[model samples]
Target chain A: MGRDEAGITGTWYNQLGSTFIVTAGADGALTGTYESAVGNAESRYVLTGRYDSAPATDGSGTALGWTVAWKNNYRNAHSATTWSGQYVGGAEARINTQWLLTSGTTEANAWASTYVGHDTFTKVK
Target chain B: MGRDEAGITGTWYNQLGSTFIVTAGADGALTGTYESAVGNAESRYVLTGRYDSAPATDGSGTALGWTVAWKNNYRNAHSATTWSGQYVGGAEARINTQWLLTSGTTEANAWASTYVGHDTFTKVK
Candidate 1:
């Protein structure tokens, strides 16, 4: 077995388009900033999340886990929004996550839904 | 078939030790910065490279390419330096790249050799 310290760093996608680059630290702490869509109001904000690699095991005794967190001040909109997601591994494993707006004090009004879904990422570097 | 736009964003390692994060843009332009090893001289510089997706076809009609570039100011030694590399893909498509300093004007003196080599990366959220 190879004992290595690994983390994730890739561009995430959604229905809207290619989003920002997400980076997970070795300590499981996630940090990154938002990249505007091809044609949208120019705005920027940072994202914070957590990743767990050890979860319950099945008959095969494999590790399972997920990532969850909130997008604080997403796009300079100045509001409260939370995003949560999970991932399962297998021959055909592809994870799809979403964000939900909990509360905020902005003219846009508080809202929640699957803003983006059904996307995949490939390692490039 | 799904047509998805994907790029690379992750930490790279070499014989010297864990290096920095390399990110490739959609148009094949690569840009990122260097992170110090666990404990070394505190210095910072940016990395630039290029990536291609189309290579010779072999029945599978697969697209392949590599990344190459130079490190302009690795660690504030302020002399002259450069780094060039390439990557190939397959079942064992683990790409191991290296950096070679060509010239400089500091106490380090002009040098040329592989600084670091051999490492892997995992995708996080």
Candidate 2:
């Protein structure tokens, strides 16, 4: 079977004004970075997953689904810290997601103890 | 076994500067609507899904995962057009999604043939 090419390109949010762009590559792998307000600390994340296509319609456009693994720079200053999740696509896809800091090093001791929340995203590009 | 409570609440995007809010209920079900610029066409949607809690940490907060069914207008005069997808939460959940117009009536004869795109969302609440 031939594998389809797809990826994720967008932003992520946190309480402390921390935002990042997540880009999934054609090989279904994700790679991107994030920047925070406190000290302007920037970090990179690795996204690995699969992409699903939506059903065909009247030939207007197409949709995509993303399943990804996210890794950040919170680990033991050596190994990468990672997490996983899923995303759906459309002209307008409603989003609700959360993340937890499992085990890793934080910058200036600012990372949350355990993070939990959600938000809505609008596709611009 | 007890069913976990979870839902989707956030924004959605389309090309014509259209936006909407999608709220999923606790029982992994979704109910929401959209408001468009083409005359403020506001319609309700039904969301169905499951919520999964993330691993515990140092007593900061809890995380959740959601699987949802989304239904919107754009179908026959009575039947609604629906879609499905998933979202994971933890403080900052990245979003990437898409939607298509199957068969239905549009607001100002302006709905596109098929809509596809993505965006990022930050958790404000």
Q: Pick the DockQ winner.
A: 2
Candidate number with greatest lDDT: 1
Looking at model 2, residue B6 earns an lDDT score of 36
Q: What is the docking quality class of candidate 2? A: incorrect
lDDT of 2 by residue, A1-125 (tens): 10212323666554455555655444223344544444313454332222222222333222222211122344211111112222434555322232222221132332332232233233442
Candidate 2 wrongly placed segments (more than 4 Å): A1-7, A10-17, A37-40, A43-84, A104-115, A119-121, B1-125
TM-score of each: 0.33, 0.28
- Give the alpha carbon lDDT tens digit for every residue of B16-111 in model 2: 554545553442222344444443134533322122223223332222221111213432121111122223245554222222222221323223
Question: Residue A67 in candidate 1 has what lDDT?
Answer: 16
CA RMSD (A), model 2: 14.4
Pairs with steric clashes in candidate 1: A8-B123, A8-B124, A9-B9, A124-B8, B15-B117, B70-B83
Task: Give the Cα-based TM-score of candidate 1 against the true structure.
Answer: 0.33
